[PDB]
C-alpha cells in the first residue's frame, strides 16, 4: 500500500519532473494530497488547466471560507484572498492597474540604469556573483520601490518579510502576521506622508481624499500596497533568477540574444512559457460540481492548477521543453493564469526581465554558473521555487 500522492512534487526548479509528463497523459485531472493533509484536484494538462481558470464557478474567494480543504495555511487575512475583487468593488481597479505598467516616463530607464549598477557593482567585487541575493531581487525592489513612489531606502525592509510572506505552510505562521500587520502600518503612513506623490502609493493617497473614494476604506488602501509591492517582488525577483538558470544553462540561447538583442522579448516569452517559479497548482475551490474530463468535480472541493503541466503540454507546445522563438502561440502560456485572476502586473514583469536579461548579457557575455547545477539550494515550503544563492562567473 501506497499513500495518495502527495504536492507539491519537487522544489526543484530547474527540472520539470518526468512524472508531471505522465499525470498528464494518463490522468490529467488526479486527486491529491496538499501540505495540509486536504484531498484536492492536480488538474496538468493545458484544456482543462483553461477551463478550470476561464469558470469562475473555481472560485478563488471561495478558497479562503473557514472548513474548505486548503493548499496551504492562510499568510494574510481571509478578506485579502479577495483582494482583486475588493479593489475592483472600490472603484480603484483602472488606476491601480494603470500606474503599475512600464509605462511611465523615465521607468525603463530606471530600470536600466538600475541594472547596470549592480551589474556594474558585481563586476569590481569580482566573481562569483551572487544573481539573485545581488542582482534579481535588488532589481525587483528598486523597481517595485519606485513603481509604488516610496523611498528606495525603505526596500529593503519591506523585502525581508517575503521569506516568510510568501511560505506555503501547513499551519499558520506567527512571524507572517507581526510582518503583515508591520508592513500595513507603514504603508499607512505612507499614505498620510506628504512627501509621497509619485507611483502607485501617491495616486491611492490622492484618490483617498477624494469625494468618490470617502467611503473605501483605509484598510483596504494599505492593503493593496503591501499586496502588490510583495506579488511583484516576489513574482519578478523569482521568475528572472530561475529565467536566468535557464538562459545560462543554454549557451546557444546566451549567444544568440547577446548577439541579436531584439530577439530578448521571444526569448523572455519562452523562459515565462517553460518557468516553474510558482510552486504549487493555482488553488481554486468548486462553488457548483462541474465536469472536468473524466471527473465530476463537486461543490466544496479543492482544484489546483498545475500551470507547468498546461505550460509543458506538447499538444499546446509542441517540443515543450525547447526554447523556440518562432513559434506560432508564444504568448499563449498560463504563465501569467487565465481569466478572471490574469496577472495585473504582466507587462511590468516582462519589462523586469528583458531589461534585466539585456545588461546583463551586455556586462556579462560569458556568464556561466560557478558551481555544478545540482549544489543549488532549492527554497523547500515556499509559494515559489528559487535557489537560496545563484552562484556565478563570467
Ligand atoms: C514575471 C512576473 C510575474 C509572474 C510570473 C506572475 C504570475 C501571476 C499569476 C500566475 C497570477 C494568477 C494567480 C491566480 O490566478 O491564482 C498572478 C496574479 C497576480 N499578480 Fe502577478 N506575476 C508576475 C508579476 C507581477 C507584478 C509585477 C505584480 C504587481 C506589481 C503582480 C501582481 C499580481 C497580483 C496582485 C495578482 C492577483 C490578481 C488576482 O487575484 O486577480 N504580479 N500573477
Same mark, same amino acid.
Given at each position: 500500500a501506497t499513500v495518495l500522492l502527495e504536492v507539491?512534487?519537487?522544489?526543484?526548479?530547474?527540472r520539470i519532473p518526468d512524472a508531471v509528463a505522465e499525470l498528464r497523459t494518463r490522468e490529467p485531472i488526479r486527486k491529491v494530497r496538499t501540505i495540509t493533509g486536504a484531498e484536492a484536484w492536480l488538474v496538468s494538462s493545458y484544456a482543462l488547466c483553461t477551463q478550470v481558470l476561464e469558470?469562475?464557478?473555481?472560485?478563488m474567494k471561495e478558497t479562503?471560507?473557514?472548513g474548505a480543504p486548503r493548499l496551504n495555511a492562510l499568510t494574510?487575512?481571509?478578506?485579502?484572498?479577495?483582494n482583486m475583487g475588493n479593489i475592483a468593488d472600490a472603484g480603484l481597479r483602472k488606476a491601480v492597474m494603470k500606474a503599475i505598467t512600464?509605462?511611465?516616463?523615465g521607468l525603463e530607464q530606471f530600470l536600466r540604469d538600475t541594472a547596470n549598477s549592480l551589474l556594474d557593482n558585481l563586476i569590481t567585487e569580482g566573481?562569483?556573483?551572487?544573481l539573485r541575493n545581488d542582482f534579481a531581487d535588488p532589481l525587483a525592489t528598486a523597481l517595485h520601490c519606485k513603481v509604488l513612489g516610496i523611498?528606495?531606502?525603505?526596500g529593503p525592509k519591506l523585502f525581508r518579510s517575503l521569506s516568510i510572506a510568501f511560505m506555503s505552510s501547513a499551519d499558520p505562521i506567527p512571524a507572517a502576521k507581526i510582518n503583515w500587520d508591520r508592513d500595513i502600518e507603514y504603508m499607512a503612513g505612507i499614505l498620510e506622508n #506628504? =512627501?509621497?506623490?509619485?507611483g502607485l502609493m501617491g495616486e491611492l493617497s490622492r484618490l483617498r481624499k477624494d469625494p468618490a473614494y470617502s467611503h473605501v476604506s483605509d484598510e483596504l488602501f494599505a492593503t493593496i500596497g503591501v499586496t502588490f509591492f510583495g506579488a511583484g517582488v516576489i513574482s519578478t525577483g523569482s521568475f528572472l533568477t530561475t529565467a536566468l538558470i535557464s538562459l545560462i544553462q543554454r549557451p546557444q540561447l546566451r549567444n544568440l540574444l547577446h548577439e541579436k538583442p531584439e530577439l530578448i522579448p521571444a526569448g523572455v516569452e519562452e523562459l515565462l512559457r517553460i518557468?516553474?517559479?510558482?510552486?504549487d497548482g493555482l488553488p481554486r475551490l468548486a462553488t457548483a460540481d462541474i465536469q472536468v474530463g473524466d471527473v465530476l468535480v463537486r461543490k466544496g472541493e479543492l482544484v489546483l492548477v498545475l500551470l507547468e503541466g498546461a505550460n509543458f503540454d506538447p499538444e499546446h507546445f #509542441? =517540443?515543450?521543453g525547447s526554447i523556440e522563438l518562432?513559434?506560432?502561440?508564444?504568448?499563449?502560456?498560463?504563465a501569467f493564469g487565465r481569466?478572471?485572476?490574469?496577472?495585473?502586473?504582466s507587462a511590468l514583469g516582462r519589462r523586469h526581465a528583458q531589461i534585466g536579461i539585456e545588461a546583463l548579457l551586455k556586462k556579462?557575455?560569458?556568464?556561466?554558473?560557478?558551481?555544478?547545477?545540482?549544489q543549488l539550494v532549492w527554497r523547500t515550503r515556499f509559494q515559489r521555487r528559487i535557489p537560496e544563492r545563484l552562484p556565478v562567473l563570467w
Open positions: 507539491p512534487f519537487s522544489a526543484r526548479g530547474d469558470d469562475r464557478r473555481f472560485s479562503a471560507a473557514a494574510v487575512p481571509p478578506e485579502v484572498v479577495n512600464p509605462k511611465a516616463p566573481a562569483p556573483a551572487d523611498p528606495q531606502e525603505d #506628504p =512627501n509621497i506623490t509619485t518557468n516553474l517559479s510558482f510552486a #509542441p =517540443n515543450p518562432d513559434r506560432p502561440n508564444p504568448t499563449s502560456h498560463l481569466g478572471q485572476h490574469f496577472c495585473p502586473g556579462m557575455p560569458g556568464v556561466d554558473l560557478a558551481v555544478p547545477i545540482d
